[PDB]
Coordinates of C-alpha atoms and ligand atoms in Angstrom, one line a residue:
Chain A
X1 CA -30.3 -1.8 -7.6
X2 CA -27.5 -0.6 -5.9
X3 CA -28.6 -2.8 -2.5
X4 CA -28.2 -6.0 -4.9
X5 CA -24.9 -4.7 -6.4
X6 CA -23.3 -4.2 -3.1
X7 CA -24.5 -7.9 -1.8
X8 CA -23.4 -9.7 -5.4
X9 CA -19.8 -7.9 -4.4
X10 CA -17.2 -9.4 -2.7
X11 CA -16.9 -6.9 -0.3
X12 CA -19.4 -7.2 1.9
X13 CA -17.4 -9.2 4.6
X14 CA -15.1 -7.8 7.3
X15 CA -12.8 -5.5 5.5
X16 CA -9.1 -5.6 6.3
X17 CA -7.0 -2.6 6.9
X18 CA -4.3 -1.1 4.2
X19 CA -0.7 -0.4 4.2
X20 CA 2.5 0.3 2.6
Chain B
X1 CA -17.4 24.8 29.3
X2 CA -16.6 21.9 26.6
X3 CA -13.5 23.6 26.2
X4 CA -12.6 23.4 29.9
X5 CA -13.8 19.8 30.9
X6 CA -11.4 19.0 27.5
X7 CA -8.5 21.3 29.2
X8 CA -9.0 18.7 32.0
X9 CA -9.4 15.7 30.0
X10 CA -5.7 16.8 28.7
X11 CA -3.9 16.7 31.8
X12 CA -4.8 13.4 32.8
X13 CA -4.4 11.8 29.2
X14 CA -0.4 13.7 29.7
X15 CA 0.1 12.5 32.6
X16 CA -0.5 8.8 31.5
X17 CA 1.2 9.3 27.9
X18 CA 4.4 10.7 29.8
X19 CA 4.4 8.0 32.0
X20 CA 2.8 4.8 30.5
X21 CA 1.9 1.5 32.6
X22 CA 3.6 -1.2 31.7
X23 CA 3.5 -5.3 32.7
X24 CA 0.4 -4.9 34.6
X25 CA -0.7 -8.6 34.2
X26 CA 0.0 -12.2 33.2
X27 CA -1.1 -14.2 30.6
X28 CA -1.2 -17.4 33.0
X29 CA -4.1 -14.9 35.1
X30 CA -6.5 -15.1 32.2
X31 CA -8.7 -18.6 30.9
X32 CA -8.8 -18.5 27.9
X33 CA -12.8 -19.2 26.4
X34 CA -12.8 -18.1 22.5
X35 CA -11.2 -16.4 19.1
X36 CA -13.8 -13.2 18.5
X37 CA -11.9 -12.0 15.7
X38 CA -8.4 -12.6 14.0
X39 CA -5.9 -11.3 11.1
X40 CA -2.9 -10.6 9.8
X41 CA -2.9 -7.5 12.2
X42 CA -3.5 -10.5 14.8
X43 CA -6.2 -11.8 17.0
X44 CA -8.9 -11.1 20.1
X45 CA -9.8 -13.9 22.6
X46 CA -12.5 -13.8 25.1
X47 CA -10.7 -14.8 28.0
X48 CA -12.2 -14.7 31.8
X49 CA -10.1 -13.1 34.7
X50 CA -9.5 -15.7 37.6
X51 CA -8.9 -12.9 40.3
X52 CA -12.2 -11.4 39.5
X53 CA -14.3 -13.8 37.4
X54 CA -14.5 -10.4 35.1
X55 CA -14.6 -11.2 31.4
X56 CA -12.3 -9.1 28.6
X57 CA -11.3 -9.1 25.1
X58 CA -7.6 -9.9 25.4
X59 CA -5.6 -9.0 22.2
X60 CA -2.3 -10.9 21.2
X61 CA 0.5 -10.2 18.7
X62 CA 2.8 -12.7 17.5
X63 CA 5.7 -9.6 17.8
X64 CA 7.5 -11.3 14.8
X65 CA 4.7 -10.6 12.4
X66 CA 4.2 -7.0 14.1
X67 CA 7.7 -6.6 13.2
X68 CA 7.3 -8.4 9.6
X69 CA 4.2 -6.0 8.8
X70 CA 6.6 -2.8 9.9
X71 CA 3.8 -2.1 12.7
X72 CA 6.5 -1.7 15.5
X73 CA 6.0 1.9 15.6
X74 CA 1.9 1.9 15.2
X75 CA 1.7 -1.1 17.9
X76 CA 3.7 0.7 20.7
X77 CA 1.1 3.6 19.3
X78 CA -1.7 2.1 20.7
X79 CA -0.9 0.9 23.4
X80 CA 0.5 4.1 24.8
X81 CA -2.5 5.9 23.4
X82 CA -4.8 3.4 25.0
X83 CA -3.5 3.3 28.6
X84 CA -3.8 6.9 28.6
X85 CA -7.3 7.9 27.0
X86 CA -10.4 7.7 28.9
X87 CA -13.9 8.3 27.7
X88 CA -17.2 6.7 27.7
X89 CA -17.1 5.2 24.3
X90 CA -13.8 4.4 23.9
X91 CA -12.7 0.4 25.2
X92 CA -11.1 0.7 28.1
X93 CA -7.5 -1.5 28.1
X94 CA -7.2 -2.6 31.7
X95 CA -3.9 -4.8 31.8
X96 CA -0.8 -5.0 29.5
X97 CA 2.2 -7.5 29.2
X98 CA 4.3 -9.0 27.2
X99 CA 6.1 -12.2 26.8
X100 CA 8.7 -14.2 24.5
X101 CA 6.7 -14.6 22.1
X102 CA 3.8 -11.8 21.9
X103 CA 2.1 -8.6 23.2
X104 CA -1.1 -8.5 24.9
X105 CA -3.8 -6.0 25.4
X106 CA -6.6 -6.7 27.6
X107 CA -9.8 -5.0 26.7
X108 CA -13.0 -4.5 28.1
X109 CA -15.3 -7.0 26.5
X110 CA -18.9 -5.7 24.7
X111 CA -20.5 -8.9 24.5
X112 CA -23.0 -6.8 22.3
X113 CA -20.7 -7.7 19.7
X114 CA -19.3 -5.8 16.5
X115 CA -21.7 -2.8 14.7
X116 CA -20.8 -4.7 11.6
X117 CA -22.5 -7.8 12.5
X118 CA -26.0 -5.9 13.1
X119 CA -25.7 -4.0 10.1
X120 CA -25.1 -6.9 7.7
X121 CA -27.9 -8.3 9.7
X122 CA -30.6 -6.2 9.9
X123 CA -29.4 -4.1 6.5
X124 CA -29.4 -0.7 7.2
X125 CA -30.2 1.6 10.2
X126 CA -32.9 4.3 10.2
X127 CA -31.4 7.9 9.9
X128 CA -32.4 8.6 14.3
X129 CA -30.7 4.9 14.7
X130 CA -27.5 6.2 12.7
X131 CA -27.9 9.2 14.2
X132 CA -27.7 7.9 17.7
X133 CA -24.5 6.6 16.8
X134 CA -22.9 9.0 15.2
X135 CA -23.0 11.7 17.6
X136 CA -21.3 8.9 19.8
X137 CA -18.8 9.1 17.2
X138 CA -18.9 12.9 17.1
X139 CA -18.1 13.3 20.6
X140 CA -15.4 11.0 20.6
X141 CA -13.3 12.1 18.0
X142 CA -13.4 15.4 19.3
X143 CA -12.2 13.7 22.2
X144 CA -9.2 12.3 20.6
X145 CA -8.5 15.1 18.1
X146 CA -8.3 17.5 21.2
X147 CA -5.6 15.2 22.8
X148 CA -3.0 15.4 19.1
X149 CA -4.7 11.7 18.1
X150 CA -5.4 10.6 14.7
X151 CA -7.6 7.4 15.0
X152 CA -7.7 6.5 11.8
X153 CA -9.6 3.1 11.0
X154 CA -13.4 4.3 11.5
X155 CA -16.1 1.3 10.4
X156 CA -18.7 -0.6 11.6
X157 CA -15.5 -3.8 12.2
X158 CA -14.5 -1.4 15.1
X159 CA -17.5 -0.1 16.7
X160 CA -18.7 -2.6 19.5
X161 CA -22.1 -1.8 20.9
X162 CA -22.3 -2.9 24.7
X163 CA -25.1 -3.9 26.8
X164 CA -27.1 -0.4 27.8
X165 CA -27.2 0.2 23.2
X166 CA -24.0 2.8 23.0
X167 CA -20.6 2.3 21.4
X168 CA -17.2 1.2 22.3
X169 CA -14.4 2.3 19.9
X170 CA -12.2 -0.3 19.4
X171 CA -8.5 -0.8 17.7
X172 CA -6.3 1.8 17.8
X173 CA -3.6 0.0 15.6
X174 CA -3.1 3.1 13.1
X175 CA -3.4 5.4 16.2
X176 CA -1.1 8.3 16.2
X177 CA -0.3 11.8 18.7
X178 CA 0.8 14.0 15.8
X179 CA 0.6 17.8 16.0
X180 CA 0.8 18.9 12.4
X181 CA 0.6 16.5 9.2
X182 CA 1.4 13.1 8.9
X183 CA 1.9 11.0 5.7
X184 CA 1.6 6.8 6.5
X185 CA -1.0 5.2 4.1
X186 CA -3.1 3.3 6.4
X187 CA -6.7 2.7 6.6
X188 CA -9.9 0.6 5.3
X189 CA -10.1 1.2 1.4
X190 CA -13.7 2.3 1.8
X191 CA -13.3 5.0 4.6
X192 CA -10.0 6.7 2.8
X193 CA -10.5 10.3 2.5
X194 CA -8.9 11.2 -0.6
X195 CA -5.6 13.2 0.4
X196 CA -4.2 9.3 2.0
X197 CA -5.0 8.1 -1.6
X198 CA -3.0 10.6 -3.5
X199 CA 0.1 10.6 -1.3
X200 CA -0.3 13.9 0.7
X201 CA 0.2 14.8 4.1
X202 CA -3.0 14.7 5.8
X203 CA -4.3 15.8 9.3
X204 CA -7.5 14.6 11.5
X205 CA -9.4 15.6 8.7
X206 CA -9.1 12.4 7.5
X207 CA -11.3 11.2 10.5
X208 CA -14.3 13.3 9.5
X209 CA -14.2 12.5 6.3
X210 CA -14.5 8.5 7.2
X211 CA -17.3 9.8 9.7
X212 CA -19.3 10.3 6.3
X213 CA -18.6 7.4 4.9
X214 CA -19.8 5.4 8.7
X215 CA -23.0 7.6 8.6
X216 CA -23.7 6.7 4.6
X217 CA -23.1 3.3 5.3
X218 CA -25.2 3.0 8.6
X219 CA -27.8 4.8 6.9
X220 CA -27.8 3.3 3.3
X221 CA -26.9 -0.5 4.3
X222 CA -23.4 -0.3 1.8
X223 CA -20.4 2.6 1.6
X224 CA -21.0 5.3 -0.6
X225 CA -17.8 4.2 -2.6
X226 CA -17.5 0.3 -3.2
X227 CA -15.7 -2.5 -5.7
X228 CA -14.5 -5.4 -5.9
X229 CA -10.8 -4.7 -5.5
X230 CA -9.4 -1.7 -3.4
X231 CA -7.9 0.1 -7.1
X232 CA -11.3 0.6 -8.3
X233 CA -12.5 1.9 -4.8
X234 CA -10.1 4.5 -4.9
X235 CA -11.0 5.9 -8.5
X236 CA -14.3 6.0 -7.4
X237 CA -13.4 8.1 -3.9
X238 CA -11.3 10.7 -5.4
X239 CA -13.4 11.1 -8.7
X240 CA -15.3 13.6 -6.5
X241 CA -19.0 12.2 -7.1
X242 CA -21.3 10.4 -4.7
X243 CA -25.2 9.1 -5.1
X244 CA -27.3 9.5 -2.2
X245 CA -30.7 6.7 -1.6
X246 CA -34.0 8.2 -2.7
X247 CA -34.5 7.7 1.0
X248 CA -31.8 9.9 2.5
X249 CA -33.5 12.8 4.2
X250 CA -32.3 16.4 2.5
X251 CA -30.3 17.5 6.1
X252 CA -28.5 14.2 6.1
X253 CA -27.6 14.5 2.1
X254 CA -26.3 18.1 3.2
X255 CA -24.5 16.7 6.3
X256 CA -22.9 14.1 4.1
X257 CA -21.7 16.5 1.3
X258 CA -19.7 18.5 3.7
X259 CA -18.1 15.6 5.1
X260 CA -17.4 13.9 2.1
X261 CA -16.1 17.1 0.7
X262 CA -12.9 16.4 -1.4
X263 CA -11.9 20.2 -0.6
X264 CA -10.4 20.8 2.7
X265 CA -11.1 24.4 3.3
X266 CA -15.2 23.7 2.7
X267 CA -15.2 19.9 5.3
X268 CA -17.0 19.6 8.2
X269 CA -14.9 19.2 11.1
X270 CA -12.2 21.0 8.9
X271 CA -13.1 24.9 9.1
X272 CA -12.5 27.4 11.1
X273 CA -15.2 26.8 13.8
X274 CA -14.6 22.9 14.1
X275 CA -16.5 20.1 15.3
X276 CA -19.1 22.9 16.1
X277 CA -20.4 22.5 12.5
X278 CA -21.3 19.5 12.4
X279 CA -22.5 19.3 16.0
X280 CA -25.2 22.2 15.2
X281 CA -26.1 20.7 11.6
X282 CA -30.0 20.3 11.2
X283 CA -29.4 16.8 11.2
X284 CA -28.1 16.5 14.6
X285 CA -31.2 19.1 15.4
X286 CA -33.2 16.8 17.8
X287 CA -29.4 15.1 19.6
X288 CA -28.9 16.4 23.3
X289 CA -25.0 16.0 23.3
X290 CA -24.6 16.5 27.3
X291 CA -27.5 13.6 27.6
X292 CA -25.6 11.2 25.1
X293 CA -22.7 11.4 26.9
X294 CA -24.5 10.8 30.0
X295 CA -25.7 7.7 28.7
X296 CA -29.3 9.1 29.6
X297 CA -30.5 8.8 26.0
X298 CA -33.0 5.4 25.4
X299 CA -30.3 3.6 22.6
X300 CA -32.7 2.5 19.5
X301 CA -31.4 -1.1 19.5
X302 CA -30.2 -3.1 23.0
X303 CA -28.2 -6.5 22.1
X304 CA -29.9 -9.7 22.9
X305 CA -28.0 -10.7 26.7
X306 CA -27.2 -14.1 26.9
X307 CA -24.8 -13.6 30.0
X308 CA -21.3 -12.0 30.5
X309 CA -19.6 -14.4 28.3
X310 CA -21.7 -15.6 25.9
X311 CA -19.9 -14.9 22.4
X312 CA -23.6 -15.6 20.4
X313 CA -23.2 -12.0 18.8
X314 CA -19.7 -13.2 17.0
X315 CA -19.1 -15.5 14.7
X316 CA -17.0 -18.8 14.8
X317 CA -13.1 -18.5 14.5
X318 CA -11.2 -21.4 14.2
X319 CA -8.8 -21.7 17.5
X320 CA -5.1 -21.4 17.2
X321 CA -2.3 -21.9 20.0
X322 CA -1.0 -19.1 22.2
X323 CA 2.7 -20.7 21.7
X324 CA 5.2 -18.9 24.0
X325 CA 8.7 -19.3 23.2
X326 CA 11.6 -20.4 25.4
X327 CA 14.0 -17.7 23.6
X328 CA 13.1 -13.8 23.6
X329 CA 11.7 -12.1 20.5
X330 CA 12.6 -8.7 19.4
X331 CA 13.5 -7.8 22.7
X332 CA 14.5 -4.7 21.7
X333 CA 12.1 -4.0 19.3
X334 CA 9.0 -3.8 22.2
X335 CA 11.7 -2.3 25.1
X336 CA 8.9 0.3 26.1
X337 CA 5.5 -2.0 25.7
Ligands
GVQ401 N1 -12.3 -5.2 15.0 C1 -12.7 -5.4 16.4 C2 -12.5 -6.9 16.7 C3 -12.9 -7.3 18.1 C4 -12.5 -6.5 19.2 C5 -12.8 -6.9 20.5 C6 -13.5 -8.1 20.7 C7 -13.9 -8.9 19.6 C8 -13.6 -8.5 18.3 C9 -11.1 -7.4 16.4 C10 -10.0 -6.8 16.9 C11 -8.8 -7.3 16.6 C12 -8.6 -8.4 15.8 CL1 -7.1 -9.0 15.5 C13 -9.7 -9.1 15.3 C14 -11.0 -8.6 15.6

């Protein structure tokens, strides 16, 4: 399931911000 | 009449962002309690207010790593944008200083704690929960984008619910009063719209399209566009596809398709009759705007109150020095903070 792809990622944390 | 209580809402914000406060506090008035949240992009203490016994977030830079990161410019940004704004769901900065060694911003504090944290939490929000929300969100960026500001970085991280259920907007880092276009790539990989991907100049269009992605993500548990690493994100986003849960009501699919819309003549928020599209879309049907901006509308979820300084609804940082140097940094550098 998408759900249990989303949890298995390492991206489910606080995301940081971007930059140049 | 929106248009003249926002006529209004101009001349005070121009009146403030002509003639900004500045040093309104001292560091040695605060105790300092607890880390809420850190970063490169620096830290937020809970920190209690000895003249009042009022508790606040207090923000500090280390104005050598602000300087490192080349966030001079976006730094003095939000703090003149944030002394000067004022709106219900927007956190209020009450003091300002600066010393040796850092920059400090004291916020109101939402002991509620982060959107993020609930999300994760409880997994996803129903669509009149996310709903409730995002017309919060609505409001505010027409707010903002009436005044010339770009916010910039919308997601749950930033989006502090308080103790009557409604949202504070916080962090306006990447905050920017820019009539016209504007090119800096900045942003959460997830809520890039895909113009800041490919290098354009881009507008508060930008905004509406990470409005999208918050309303997916409140309302499916995860972003419509996710990875592991940020490169693979970014394919996905501009690739110009998205998949919408089985249980995604048809009006918020169609809501959602207009505000992830790659094309910027056909995006919500975008055309020629503005936030006005999105605020009469069948999906916002059943919101009374005046009442949620009233605060008179019952907020689906109310944080657990523990007291004005309990920090239960954050998690654990570990604590780290406020070191103040004996020698001036970047004097220059922050002349105007
Ligand atoms: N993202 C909002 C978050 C926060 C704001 C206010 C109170 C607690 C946490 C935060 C902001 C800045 C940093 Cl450096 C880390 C964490």
């Amino acid at each position: 399931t998408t759900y249990a792809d989303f949890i298995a990622s390492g991206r489910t944390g606080r995301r940081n911000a971007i930059h140049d | 009449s929106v248009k003249e209580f926002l006529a209004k809402a101009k001349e005070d914000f121009l009146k403030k962002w002509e003639n900004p406060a500045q040093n309104t506090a001292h560091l040695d008035q605060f105790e300092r309690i607890k880390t809420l949240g850190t970063g490169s992009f620096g830290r937020v203490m809970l920190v209690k207010h000895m003249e009042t016994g009022n508790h606040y977030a207090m923000k500090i830079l280390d104005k050598q790593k602000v300087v490192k990161l080349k966030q001079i410019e976006h730094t003095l940004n939000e703090k003149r944008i944030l002394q000067a704004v004022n709106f219900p769901f927007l956190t209020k900065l009450e003091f300002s200083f600066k010393d040796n060694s850092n920059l400090y911003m004291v916020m109101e504090y939402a002991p509620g704690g982060e959107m993020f944290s609930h999300l994760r939490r409880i997994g996803r929000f129903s669509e009149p929960h996310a709903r409730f929300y995002a017309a919060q969100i609505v409001l505010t960026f027409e707010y903002l984008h009436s005044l010339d500001l770009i916010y910039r970085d919308l997601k749950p991280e930033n989006l502090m619910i308080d103790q009557q259920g409604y949202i504070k907007v916080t962090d306006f880092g990447f905050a920017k009063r820019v009539k016209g276009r504007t090119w800096t790539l900045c942003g959460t990989p997830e809520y890039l719209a895909p113009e800041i991907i490919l290098s354009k100049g881009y507008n508060k269009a930008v905004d509406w399209w990470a409005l999208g992605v918050l309303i997916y993500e409140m309302a499916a548990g995860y972003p419509p566009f996710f990875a592991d690493q940020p490169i693979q994100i970014y394919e996905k986003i501009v690739s110009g596809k998205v998949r919408f849960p089985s249980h995604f009501s048809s009006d918020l699919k169609d809501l959602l398709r207009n505000l992830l819309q790659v094309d910027l003549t056909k995006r919500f928020g975008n055309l020629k009759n503005g936030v006005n599209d999105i605020k009469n879309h069948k999906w916002f049907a059943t919101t009374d705007w005046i009442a949620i901006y009233q605060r008179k509308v019952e907020a689906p979820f109310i944080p657990k109150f523990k007291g004005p300084g309990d920090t239960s609804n954050f998690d654990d940082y570990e604590e780290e020095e406020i070191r103040v140097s004996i020698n001036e940094k970047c004097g220059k550098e922050f002349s105007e903070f």
